[PDB]
Design a protein around this ligand. Structure first.
Ligand SMILES: CC(C)Nc1nc2ccccc2[nH]1
Ligand SMILES: CC(C)Nc1nc2ccccc2[nH]1
Ligand SMILES: [Zn+2]
Ligand SMILES: [Zn+2]
Ligand SMILES: [Zn+2]
Length: 572
């Protein structure tokens, strides 16, 4: 009950009992909170409540110290001091932004802006509070009791009346009952059980709510610049494949942390693995939020690094399949590949944090808390997709508010920019270069003459709120008959429900833009589906079209994004 004040450090006994995290506030700061917010409960060893029997006055502004004990105006003895005077609340050892963070519901963009423009200790407060609020929100949805099982990938669900029915995408992971995590896709619903088990009739699912631990470490450790490469030993024989990245690899060694902005297909994983071959003694921990991000860094490591010094760390609560070709759960290997959530407490010469646009400030903190490293390298692209903010429903979260790393990349610029896309036909590179990279992204590849756009608004139907455009799928079906090379194309849309319909009618493999991020396919068919803020998001659009190595067909709903596409237009 005796801690440091989460604004100005000053020691105190005073926590806010009305904040859901119960931060230590100093007397000067605890006042400025309780006199400007609905927050009136102050905690110490014993709470600031009237000590008089059967009295329910808990508001610190209405209370006094009568000797050793606390009382209201109705109960205080004659010789009694008010708890709230001279800009202080009586405690031992005797903020606008803090107030907004403490009282916001996290449904407004402006909440996330503030949680990223504030001081560093407030960003940790912001991050615990948000994650806490995100988790206490999960409780608010209804249970799904199984009515009838049909097959091994279809069942019928009965939903708890009174409480809302949560969105049934790959984003919302359920816990069955204890029969391992489960997911759902659209009364013909598809059940994807992480642990295989013949789905019991009467068994029920609930959204996994995990206790939010406190944050000690900053999002970003303070920035150190060195005159010499510190604690790392470069090779002089450095394989020509990685010669582009030498001057950036020497930057990495002459700073505490470095930011790398790599637009799609610019050699981010090449750089991350190229760092181990340049500092070949250095112990490196490769981390990202998702199993797919970590498994891609593993694929690159298998090609260029010795397999006996590589370990893939897997949490005992195995939620998906992931990389098998390394030794599993050897914490002590030179090369450690691990999702942020499963990190051990370790030291490292270098930590590489990949897919940084998907990182929350919570994630940035946990990494500084689990990994103690000479150098931190932050790899991703603020022009790509952020982690979904399930509470945010009002306003759009701009890239500079994604996390502290993206804020740095969008303000002072990144330390290192991979400026040549080697994946995408020039038509795609030229479009996204103008759209999100201020014309600084260059095409290696020639124009493919296999990049098509069609403006076709079609008809928008909705499965709950997820959008479908059958006519846009119909246009694709027509195109495929005349373009058999596209038979092998991945179908991409901003909506699962669209993808579900496109699966049945086209037979193509299916990916949402968000789940496509980090992957590449020869041919891509993209139906925008709707003209919403979701489907017009320039970051989502950027990712959607940069998945393609050879060709893309974009059926567009939005005039602006249609006109910007530097593609041959089709008719019909
Ligand atoms: C062509 C072979 C050697 N691999 C290779 N060289 C790269 C250089 C920069 C970015 C990505 C790269 N991938
Ligand atoms: C330095 C001593 C006290 N042990 C220690 N504490 C750690 C915390 C995070 C990562 C690695 C750590 N190793
Ligand atoms: Zn409070
Ligand atoms: Zn203080
Ligand atoms: Zn009283």
């Amino acid at each position: 009950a005796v801690g440091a004040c989460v604004l100005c450090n000053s020691q105190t006994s005073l926590r806010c009992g009305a904040c859901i995290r119960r931060p230590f506030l100093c007397c000067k700061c605890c006042y400025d909170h309780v006199i400007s917010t609905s927050h009136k409960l102050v905690l110490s060893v014993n709470p600031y409540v009237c000590n008089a029997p059967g009295c329910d006055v808990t508001d610190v502004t209405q209370l006094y110290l009568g000797g050793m004990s606390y009382y209201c105006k109705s109960h205080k003895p004659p010789i009694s001091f008010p708890l709230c005077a001279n800009g202080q609340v009586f405690g031992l050892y005797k903020v606008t932004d803090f107030n907004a963070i403490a009282t916001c519901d996290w449904t407004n963009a402006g909440d996330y802006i503030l949680a990223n423009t504030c001081t560093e200790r407030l960003k940790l407060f912001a991050a615990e509070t948000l994650k806490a609020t995100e988790e206490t929100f999960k409780l608010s949805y209804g249970i799904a009791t199984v009515r009838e099982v049909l097959s091994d990938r279809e069942l019928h669900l009965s939903w708890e009346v009174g409480k809302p029915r949560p969105p049934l995408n790959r984003n919302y992971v359920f816990t069955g009952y204890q029969i391992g995590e489960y997911t759902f896709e659209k009364d013909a619903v598809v059940y994807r059980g992480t642990t295989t088990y013949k789905l019991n009739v009467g068994d029920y699912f609930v959204l996994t709510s995990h206790t939010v631990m406190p944050l000690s470490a900053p999002t970003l450790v303070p920035q150190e610049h060195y005159v010499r490469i510190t604690g790392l030993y470069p090779t002089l024989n450095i394989s020509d494949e990685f010669s582009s990245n030498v001057a950036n690899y020497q930057k990495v060694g002459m700073q505490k942390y470095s930011t790398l902005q790599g637009p799609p297909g610019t050699g981010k994983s090449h750089f991350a693995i190229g760092l181990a071959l340049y500092y070949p003694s250095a112990r490196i921990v490769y981390t990202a939020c998702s199993h797919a991000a970590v498994d891609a860094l593993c694929e690159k490591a298998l090609k260029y690094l010795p397999i006996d010094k590589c370990s893939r760390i897997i949490p005992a609560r195995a939620r998906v399949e992931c990389f098998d070709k390394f030794k599993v759960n050897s914490t002590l290997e030179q090369y450690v590949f691990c999702t942020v959530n499963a990190l051990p407490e370790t030291t490292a010469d270098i930590v590489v944090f990949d897919e940084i646009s998907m990182a929350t400030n919570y994630d940035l903190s946990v990494v500084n808390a689990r990994l103690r490293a000479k150098h931190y390298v932050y790899i991703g692209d603020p022009a790509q997709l952020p982690a979904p903010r399930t509470l945010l429903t009002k306003g759009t979260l701009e890239p500079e508010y994604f996390n502290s790393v993206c804020r740095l990349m969008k303000t002072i610029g990144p330390d290192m920019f991979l400026g040549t896309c080697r994946r995408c036909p020039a038509e795609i590179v030229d479009t996204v270069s103008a759209l999100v990279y201020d014309n600084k992204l260059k095409a290696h590849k020639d124009k493919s003459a296999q990049c098509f756009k069609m403006f076709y608004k079609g008809v928008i139907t909705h499965d709950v709120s997820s959008a479908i455009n059958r006519p846009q799928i119909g246009v694709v079906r027509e195109f495929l008959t005349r373009n058999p090379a596209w038979r092998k194309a991945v179908f991409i849309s901003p909506y699962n429900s669209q993808n579900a319909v496109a699966s049945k009618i086209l037979g193509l493999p299916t990916q949402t833009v968000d789940s496509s991020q980090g992957s590449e396919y020869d041919y891509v068919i993209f139906t925008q589906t709707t003209e919403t803020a979701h489907s017009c998001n320039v970051n989502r659009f950027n990712v959607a079209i940069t998945r393609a190595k050879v060709g893309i067909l974009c059926i567009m709903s939005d005039r602006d994004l249609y006109d910007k596409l530097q593609f041959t237009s089709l008719e019909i």
